[PDB]
Scaffold this active site. Structure first.
Site, short mmCIF file in Angstrom:
data_model
loop_
_atom_site.label_atom_id
_atom_site.label_comp_id
_atom_site.label_asym_id
_atom_site.label_seq_id
_atom_site.Cartn_x
_atom_site.Cartn_y
_atom_site.Cartn_z
CB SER C 370 -1.19 9.26 -4.89
N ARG C 371 -1.02 6.72 -2.62
CA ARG C 371 -0.25 5.55 -2.20
C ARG C 371 0.35 4.83 -3.40
CB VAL C 372 -0.85 2.45 -5.80
#
Ligand SMILES: Nc1ncnc2c1ncn2[C@@H]1O[C@H](COP(=O)(O)OP(=O)(O)O)[C@@H](O)[C@H]1O
Ligand SMILES: Nc1ncnc2c1ncn2[C@@H]1O[C@H](COP(=O)(O)OP(=O)(O)O)[C@@H](O)[C@H]1O
Ligand SMILES: [Mg+2]
Lengths: 469, 51, 500, 119, 146
Positions: C370-372
């Site tokens: 997950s990036r954010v």
């Protein structure tokens, strides 16, 4: 009547020119008088303009000249439906090919029709009782879905279709509809003679399964329209009479290949792996019609064939998305002592959950699948280390797994002339109670041969006491 | 000799099991390459005939 | 050698008087086939405008050349013949939106198919809407609770981000999106409007029996009253299934522009790419890779860019996108798989190897990320799960190649954490119950228990912590974090219950 | 280009990504009358890519360090948009998908990345 | 610049044909360079042509033929793909004593993709020339240059 003139004739594609305002619509059957034949059916595909529309003939177009009379029927390819089509060999145009007179039908429904809406569909997935012990516990069939029958030659494909149609007509009162699309010439004559000697198709009595002829010796229009002719007769018994009909499409791979042949010869570009561009649209128009309505359902038991052993192809992945159940018939059993060769681990279904079959049926299906999977993986170590070089828990589980594999293989009613045993039709409640008692230790003292060729908990107690004394 | 023969049976079983996983992965790549070769060859004949 | 347009039929109308009817808005159907309709006319008709045939079938005028206009029919080809009179609606391809669509199953054009009557729409938004820029966007900070223990601790999702769901068939693609929508009943039934999230299930490419069975399960658990259902089966036309992603994004965008959160689930992303390529192949176009057009990557990137988080000057809402990618044998490097992974901020890989062994759902820690998701998560769940993503990926590679002293400690702690995080179907947990179960498996409190008693230990610890220590469970959900006093009380309650 | 020719400064061009320039022109080439090329691409692939890559070089007035990034089409280096851009770069940094799943940060392929300054 | 500093650019012809020009300029680079070197072989001198590269000349000829409304062949190329490279290399041959005694050497470089020599443009140039120099990428990275 609307008359037309033939303007082009290039194989199966025949263009007809009509007048202004009297042109036919799409999917319209066109009549054509010939010599020895009755009427040459020609389904309309699209309109090219200038009072002309291209059509695809469903028979041989040899001998047609430029300027022949082409009469329009006004609707689609109608076929005979009802109880008069049972026991007769029908074709793609609704004509008899059994030389037993014409089908005296009261009404004729068209092959091109819309499916059910979202408000008239079933809100819950129901299970379909087939009568077999290995099908009502493992991969259960859904009421109104598609089931794939995968198997080789001589495994038990023709015997499984005859036993399932007779058990559903006696326990539930539903007819069958065998639509052999893309079959061979010798396979069509052998299937009709075998059903009359078993009691499925009676010429003088009462029949219970429809015969739809659809060999590959015709053109591309007759093979692609064979699936719509067989599905129209089975859908009339569930909407007008209300019965759980069972449709058979042997094979399922012939329907996808026949649709791309007529589309490539008309001018459409190909897609992937030499397939047509409307692969998801043609397969979805015929699979959604065999669903569950408010008056009845329509099960599908087609035989899916993988292309060169590839499940990720365009003809295998498109048909697997709508299949709810699967009846895989591997070649591991058959001669091993299982009637029939039904794989308990390869045959899976989406209706084998705890919210569709209940908490009692989900516990019995999970326990039988875990014991069969552990015994199959331990076969490589038992042949190299013996059977006595195990622990206490491994010895008790190996003895119960041999008797559970033969208890699910019961003798059918139509296979009494090959095995000699009587036909056993176990219900859904009797199959779940017999499998739960063997896994708890109530039948641990019984022999391994007492459960073979038997069905139900009452048949195992009578065969074990009569084997010794 | 008994220990070397027993160790050779475990190495032969591990080599046979590893070959089955590599054959299954190569079969998935060969099936995708066979379908892509039929689509690439058919697109070249359809482009030259329509021009 | 000749040309189209005026030919035979269309060439005998301009020699006399081609007036009477208005040819600027209406038109005569000259040809129809392969999901197209060559209407003769439509001079004042704009591009991508809604049309209507004489039988009631809708149409969309794509190309507008001289003398002809290519209209794309959204229904069957039998409802349009040669010589029919068409009509234009005057607007573009729009659909109904507003707060009155919650609780009904709509289709691709916005019509109701559930039989509940008409939909009280508050407006009309177009399907082809542009995404926001960098001035009306903000960072994702709100937390999106999905209910699963293996998803809220590893790769968490947030309001305004796009989390993909790749995987094969029968692995857990559609099961992850259904559990996240049913777990929002604890915040939508209250009075907190900022914590609520309206679901938006867009079933594209699914069967007719699968769409009716999924809507009945959500209504029995009080979850269909605030969720939009976009029915789009494969038995319709190719234009209806391809426009299902654009029509569902316009209805969920009304809540994000006013002050509410939305969650869109495009199930599936692989079924939408096959419907768009069927209509483009019939219009004589160039096929690129995997028999797809050149605008295949632009269709998925434009619909996913609109699901972003707005700033405080635009309302403060956000839109979450959950696209499910159907892989063919785990091929993550395909043509449709590479375009969805390069436009979304993270993905959830669903391997088919661990799904058949009992690990439901099979979420790979070494592939899904997950990036954010780090800043858009709860502080209580992130503090108890220290280095949970790094320890899960290293324990899988060491167990596949295996008895040392260091390897025995990682194998015993990794097996208990994977079994405790695997939940059943339709069994979501809250943020306070998942923080107490993840803190015992990472501190060594579950190493003394057996492997088969992993399911019994999760139900016994959650029931004892809701009657004997209610002050610790309520403080982790209201405040969202754990200080020095909250961390000492959780360690004493877990040690006393494990010895009895 | 104006900061290195009219002013004489070492500019740094960073394109992300460079593969989007060739993919955008292939979707509009079918409606302009051009025939399709390899894998459904435009016929002027080497002419359009060579006209833009030659202007981002170092001249006598100033230098221009181009640090663009190419995208592999479905993990394939033999495509028409990946193999045509390898003849207009001094240093290449290919990122393999097999080394990224093992734990390499990043997945720098040593058997595929080459440069002209390695002497 | 490297040939002028080592006293080698005074007797060497440089044919500038970049990829930023038109497709007709890059496709005609092989026929224009062979005409200038043929004057020395027909008088009594030796020449050495270097067509770098042979893979770039095949892509330039297929771009101009596809835009002139012509049918393609294999791998989206023209019909006379093998005839274009075989005609330009057949002129670089050693003459006899009655023609002047000159010769012309041809050095065509073939740009491969991953060592695949079984391609369409790779197999066509290898069956027309009198030998080939295979340059593998495995021994070039270890230090064995060339
Ligand atoms: N329940 C059963 N018990 C014993 N033999 C069976 C049973 N079912 C099928 N068979 C055998 O399987 C064979 C199937 O033959 P056939 O129908 O020609 O091939 P296929 O089943 O592949 O179509 C039959 O010869 C029959 O003897
Ligand atoms: N937590 C779980 N426990 C048990 N079974 C599950 C769980 N999650 C998913 N499943 C099973 O996985 C199956 C997924 O089916 P489906 O949604 O059709 O395929 P996909 O998940 O690939 O879209 C369901 O039939 C369900 O029984
Ligand atoms: Mg799904």
């Amino acid at each position: 009547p609307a008359s037309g003139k033939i303007r082009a004739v290039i194989g199966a594609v025949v263009d007809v020119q009509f007048e202004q305002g009297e042109l036919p619509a799409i999917l319209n059957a066109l009549t054509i008088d010939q010599g020895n034949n009755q009427k040459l059916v020609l389904e309309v595909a699209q309109h090219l303009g200038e009072n002309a529309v291209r059509a695809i003939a469903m028979d041989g177009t040899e001998g047609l000249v430029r300027g022949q009379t082409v009469v329009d029927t006004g609707a689609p390819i109608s076929v005979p439906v009802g109880r008069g089509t049972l026991g007769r060999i029908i074709n793609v145009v609704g004509e008899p090919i059994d030389e037993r007179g014409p089908i005296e039908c009261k009404q004729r429904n068209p092959i091109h029709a819309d499916p059910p809406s979202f408000v008239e569909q079933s809100t819950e997935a129901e299970v379909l009782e087939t009568g077999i012990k290995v099908v009502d516990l493992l991969a259960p069939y859904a009421r109104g879905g598609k089931i794939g029958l995968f198997g080789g030659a001589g495994v038990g494909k023709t015997v499984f279709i005859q036993e399932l149609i007779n058990n559903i007509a006696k326990a539930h009162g539903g007819f069958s509809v065998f639509t052999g699309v893309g079959e061979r010439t010798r396979e069509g004559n052998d299937l009709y003679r075998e059903m009359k000697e078993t009691g499925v198709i009676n010429l003088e009595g009462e029949s219970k399964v429809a015969l739809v002829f659809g060999q590959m010796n015709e053109p591309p229009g007759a093979r692609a329209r064979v699936a719509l002719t067989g599905l129209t007769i089975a859908e009339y018994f569930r909407d007008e009479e209300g019965q759980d009909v069972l449709l058979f499409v042997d094979n399922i791979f012939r329907f996808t290949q026949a649709g791309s042949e007529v589309s490539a010869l008309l001018g459409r570009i190909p897609s992937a792996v030499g397939y047509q561009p409307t692969l998801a649209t043609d397969m979805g128009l015929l699979q959604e019609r065999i669903t569950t309505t408010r008056k009845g359902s329509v099960t599908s038991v087609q035989a899916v064939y993988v292309p060169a052993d590839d499940l990720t192809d365009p003809a295998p992945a498109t048909t697997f998305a709508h299949l709810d159940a699967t009846t895989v018939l591997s070649r591991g059993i058959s001669e091993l002592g299982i009637y029939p060769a039904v794989d308990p681990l390869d045959s899976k279904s989406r209706l084998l959950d705890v919210s569709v079959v209940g908490q009692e049926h989900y516990d019995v299906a999970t326990g039988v699948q875990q014991t069969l999977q552990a015994y199959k993986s331990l076969q490589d170590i038992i042949a190299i280390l013996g059977m006595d070089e195990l622990s206490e828990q491994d010895k008790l589980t190996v003895e119960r797994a041999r008797k559970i594999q033969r208890f699910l293989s019961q003798p059918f009613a139509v296979a009494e002339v090959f095995t000699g045993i009587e036909g056993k039709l176990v219900r859904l409640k009797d199959t779940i109670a017999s499998f739960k008692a063997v896994l708890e230790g109530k039948y641990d003292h019984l022999p391994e041969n007492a459960f073979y060729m038997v069905g139900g908990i009452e048949d195992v107690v009578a065969k074990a006491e009569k084997i010794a004394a | 000799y008994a220990s070397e023969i027993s160790a050779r049976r475990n190495a032969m079983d591990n080599a046979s099991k590893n070959a089955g996983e590599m054959i299954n992965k190569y079969s998935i790549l060969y099936n995708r390459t066979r379908q892509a070769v039929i689509t690439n060859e058919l697109v070249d004949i359809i482009t030259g005939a329509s021009s | 050698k000749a040309a189209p347009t005026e030919v035979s039929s269309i060439l005998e109308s301009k020699i006399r008087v081609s007036d009477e009817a208005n040819l600027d808005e209406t038109g005569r159907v000259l040809s129809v086939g392969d999901g197209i309709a060559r209407v003769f006319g439509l001079n004042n008709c704009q591009a991508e405008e809604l049309v209507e045939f004489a039988s009631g079938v809708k149409g969309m005028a794509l190309n507008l050349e001289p003398g002809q206009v290519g209209i794309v029919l959204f229904g069957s080809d039998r409802e349009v013949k040669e010589g029919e009179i068409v009509k234009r609606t005057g607007k573009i391809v729009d659909v109904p939106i507003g707060p009155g669509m919650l609780g009904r199953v709509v289709d691709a054009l916005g019509n109701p198919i559930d039989g509940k009557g008409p939909i009280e729409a508050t407006g009309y938004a177009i399907a082809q809407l542009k995404a926001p820029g960098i001035l009306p966007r903000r960072s994702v900070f709100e937390p999106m609770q999905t209910g699963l223990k293996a998803v809220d601790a590893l790769v968490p999702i947030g309001r305004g981000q796009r989390e993909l769901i790749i995987g094969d068939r029968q692995t857990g693609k559609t099961a992850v999106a259904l559990d996240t929508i049913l777990n929002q009943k604890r915040w939508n039934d209250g009075n907190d409007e900022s914590k609520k999230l309206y679901c938006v299930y867009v079933a594209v490419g699914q069967k007719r029996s699968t769409v009716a069975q999924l809507v009945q399960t959500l209504e029995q658990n009080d979850a269909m009253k605030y969720s939009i259902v976009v029915a789009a089966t494969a038995s319709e036309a190719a234009p209806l299934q391809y426009l299902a992603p654009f029509t569902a994004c316009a209805i969920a965008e009304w809540f994000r522009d006013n002050g509410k959160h939305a969650l869109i689930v495009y199930d599936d992303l692989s079924k939408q790419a096959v419907a768009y390529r069927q209509l483009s192949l019939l219009l004589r176009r160039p096929p690129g890779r995997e028999a797809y057009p050149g605008d295949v990557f632009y269709l998925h990137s434009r619909l996913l860019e609109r699901a972003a988080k707005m700033s405080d000057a635009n309302g403060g809402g956000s839109l979450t996108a959950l696209p499910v990618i159907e892989t063919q044998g785990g091929d993550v490097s395909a043509y449709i798989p590479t375009n969805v992974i390069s436009i979304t901020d993270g993905q959830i890989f669903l391997e088919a190897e661990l799904f058949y062994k009992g690990i439901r759902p099979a979420i790979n820690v070494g592939l899904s990320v997950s990036r954010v998701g780090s800043a858009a998560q709860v502080k209580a769940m992130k503090q108890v799960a220290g280095s949970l993503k790094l320890f899960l990926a290293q324990y899988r590679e060491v167990a596949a190649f295996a008895l040392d002293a260091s390897t025995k400690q990682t194998l015993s702690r990794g097996e208990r954490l994977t079994q405790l995080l695997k939940q059943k179907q339709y069994s979501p947990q809250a943020s306070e119950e998942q923080v107490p179960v993840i803190y015992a498996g990472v501190n060594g409190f579950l190493d003394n228990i057996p492997i088969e008693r992993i399911p019994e230990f999760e139900e016994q610890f959650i029931a004892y912590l809701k009657a004997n220590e209610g002050d610790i469970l309520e403080a982790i959900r209201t405040k969202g974090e754990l200080s020095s006093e909250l961390l000492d009380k959780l360690k004493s309650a877990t040690e006393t219950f494990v010895a009895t």
